[PDB]
Amino acid sequence: GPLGSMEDFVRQCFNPMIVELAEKTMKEYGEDLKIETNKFAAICTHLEVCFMYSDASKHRFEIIEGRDRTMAWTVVNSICNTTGAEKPKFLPDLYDYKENRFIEIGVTRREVHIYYLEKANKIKSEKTHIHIFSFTGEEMATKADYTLDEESRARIKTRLFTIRQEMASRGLWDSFRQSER
Ligand SMILES: Oc1ccc(/C=N/Nc2ccc(Cl)cc2)c(O)c1O
Ligand SMILES: [Mn+2]
Ligand SMILES: [Mn+2]
Numbered sequence: 001g002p003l004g005s006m007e008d009f010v011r012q013c014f015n016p017m018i019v020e021l022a023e024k025t026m027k028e029y030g031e032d033l034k035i036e037t038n039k040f041a042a043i044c045t046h047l048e049v050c051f052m053y054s055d056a057s058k059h060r061f062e063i064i065e066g067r068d069r070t071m072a073w074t075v076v077n078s079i080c081n082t083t084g085a086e087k088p089k090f091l092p093d094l095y096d097y098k099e100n101r102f103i104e105i106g107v108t109r110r111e112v113h114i115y116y117l118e119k120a121n122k123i124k125s126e127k128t129h130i131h132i133f134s135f136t137g138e139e140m141a142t143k144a145d146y147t148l149d150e151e152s153r154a155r156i157k158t159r160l161f162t163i164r165q166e167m168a169s170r171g172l173w174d175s176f177r178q179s180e181r
Contacts, residue, residue, distance in 0.1 A: 004170035006037040013166060014044045021047055021066045028069060038179035045163060046107045049133060049156055050093045053105060056152035057098075065093040065105070076102075086127055096129070096147065103147070106132040107160070109177045116140040135160045135177075 011019055022043040026033050033040040047066050054061040062079060064072050072091050079095050080087045085102070092102035104123060108115040112134045119130050120142075131147060132140045137157045139146065146153060167173040 004172055006041055006172050009170055009172055010041050010044055018044050018047050038176050041176060049107050050105050052156050056148045060098050062095040064091060088128055090123055092128055102128045104128055104130045109135045109180055112138045112140045135164050
């Protein structure tokens with residue numbers, strides 16, 4: 001019936017720190033969240049997934065996403081110097097200290113395999129590990145290595161389902177889904 005505001009939804013659905021980091025992200029790119037509200041939600045979603053992924057194993061992962069850009073490269077370059085890891089061409093989302101690799105996390109409602117192939121074709125690296133989550137609960141990962149166990153990943157998928165559900169109940173899902181890409 002009633003169609004809600006996506007900005008209202010974001011500020012209610014996501015933790016204050018995620019929202020703030022997403023605001024900083026958009027401002028850093030010169031974007032108005034009051035107009036590009038679906039993107040604001042997507043940024044929040046992706047940041048939450050990255051944080052959940054890291055939290056699945058505390059201190060196993062360094063978080064790169066959410067930091068300001070200069071600081072993100074500072075962190076990446078430090079990790080590369082310390083661990084000997086090869087420097088990525090584009091900023092990744094995490095660094096896995098156990099498997100010794102950077103990780104790019106994708107969140108999509110497009111077809112998960114195509115999305116994976118596009119990510120992989122962009123970053124080009126033979127080292128950076130890619131992990132894609134769909135709002136459908138589908139996932140795809142480099143070399144069928146999913147990194148975390150089923151329960152951790154289920155928690156992330158459950159979060160995505162809950163977001164899609166709350167959006168839909170406020171009439172926001174169709175627009176949000178369409179806005180991707
Ligand atoms: O420049 C942009 C303008 C709008 C968007 C919107 N993305 N929306 C979005 C992205 C991913 C999912 Cl799963 C659902 C929705 C976006 O991702 C952009 O990069
Ligand atoms: Mn990123
Ligand atoms: Mn990502």
